Structure 1
Amino acid sequence: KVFGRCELAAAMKRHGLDNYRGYSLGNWVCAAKFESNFNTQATNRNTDGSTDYGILQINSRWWCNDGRTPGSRNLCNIPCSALLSSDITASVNCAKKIVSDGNGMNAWVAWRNRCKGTDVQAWIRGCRL
């Protein structure tokens, strides 16, 4: 599923991400826009053989099992395919563990390079939340 901006903001809000660990909702919308273009089916392979999955491009080296990333951990305890669903629940729950790990949203390279320090509230302007 390809979400619209406001539709995704509302789904994220309902799943408890607005101000989760101090990150306002617009941070999470901005990250999803530049990680996946709001497409739950996005996959991208990394140089190390790991793969990133879903709307938040969660990486198979630490966070999920895809059966092809040798010596990887599965810290969210889920198959990586569950992250590609039209229901963002699994992605959201895993993201909450990632952002709690110590580096906050810096774990998402596109957040750090494209969202961090910008006016992220613009990502939720116009939305009925």
Structure 2
Amino acid sequence: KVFGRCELAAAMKRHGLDNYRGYSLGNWVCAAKFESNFNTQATNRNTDGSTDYGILQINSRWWCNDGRTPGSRNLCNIPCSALLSSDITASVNCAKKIVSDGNGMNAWVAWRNRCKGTDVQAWIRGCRL
């Protein structure tokens, strides 16, 4: 599924991500935008041979098992495919875990490089939340 901007934010709010660990809703939407372009089916291969999966580009080295990632923890206890679903529940639950493992939203390098410090509320602008 390829979500609308405000459509993603609503579903993200409904699932408890607005100021989850202190990060306003626009930080999550901004992350989604540059990681996945709001596409739940996005996949990308990392240089270390793992792949990133889904709206929030959650990765197989630690978070999920895709059956082709060596030295891989599955800390979110999900097959990586669960993260490509039109239902964001598993992505959003895995995010919550990732964002709490010490380095906050800096785990998503796109967020650090592209969202961190910017006018992030712009991403939840115009939206009926």
With the length of structure 2 as denominator, give the TM-score of the two structures: 0.99
Q: CA deviation at 1:94?
A: 0.1
Deviations 1:56-87 (A, max 9, x none): 00010000000100110000000000000000
Q: CA deviation at 1:47?
A: 1.1
SS in 2 for 1:110: helix
RMSD: 0.4
SS in 2 for 1:111: helix
SS in 2 for 1:102: coil
SS in 2 for 1:52: strand
Q: CA deviation at 1:110?
A: 0.6
Q: CA deviation at 1:10?
A: 0.2
SS in 1 for 2:75: coil
Deviations 1:15-46 (A, max 9, x none): 00000000000000000000000000000001
Number of residue pairs matched by the alignment: 129
Unmatched segments (≥5 aa) in structure 2: none
Separation in structure 2 between the aligned mates of residue 37 and residue 109 of structure 1, nearest angstrom: 15
Q: CA deviation at 1:100?
A: 0.5
Q: Percent identity?
A: 100
SS in 1 for 2:98: helix
Separation in structure 2 between the aligned mates of residue 73 and residue 103 of structure 1, nearest angstrom: 18
Q: CA deviation at 1:125?
A: 0.5
SS in 2 for 1:74: coil
Q: CA deviation at 1:114?
A: 0.5
Partner of 1:80: 80
Partner of 1:47: 47
With the length of structure 1 as denominator, give the TM-score of the two structures: 0.99
After TM superposition, list the pairs within 5 Å mapping 1:1-129 onto structure 2: 1-129=1-129
Deviant stretches of 4+, over 4 Å = none
Unmatched segments (≥5 aa) in structure 1: none
